[PDB]
């Protein structure tokens, strides 16, 4: 429906905890609108959690 498609493809991945090196390295090494998107999501959030 109207922009109604959050599932679209299959399931993404569980990034409960990730190291800054793995994120910076993964993004620099691997490449995928999925990983890059999810990686950036936690990247920013991790930098800002607001107590």
How far apart CA 20 and CA 41 sit, in angstroms, is 13
CB atoms under 10 Å from CB of 14, counted, come to 7
Q: Is 13 exposed, middle or buried (0-12, 13-18, 19+ CB in 10 A)?
A: exposed
CA of residue 13 relative to chain centroid, distance: 8
Method for this entry: NMR
| Cβ neighbours for 11, distance < 8 A, ≥ 6 positions apart | none
């Amino acid at each position: 429906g109207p922009l109604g498609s959050p599932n679209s493809g299959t399931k993404k991945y569980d990034l409960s905890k990730w190291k800054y090196a793995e994120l910076r390295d993964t993004i620099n090494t691997s490449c995928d609108i999925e990983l890059l998107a999810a990686c950036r999501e936690e990247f920013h959030r991790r930098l800002k959690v607001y107590h």
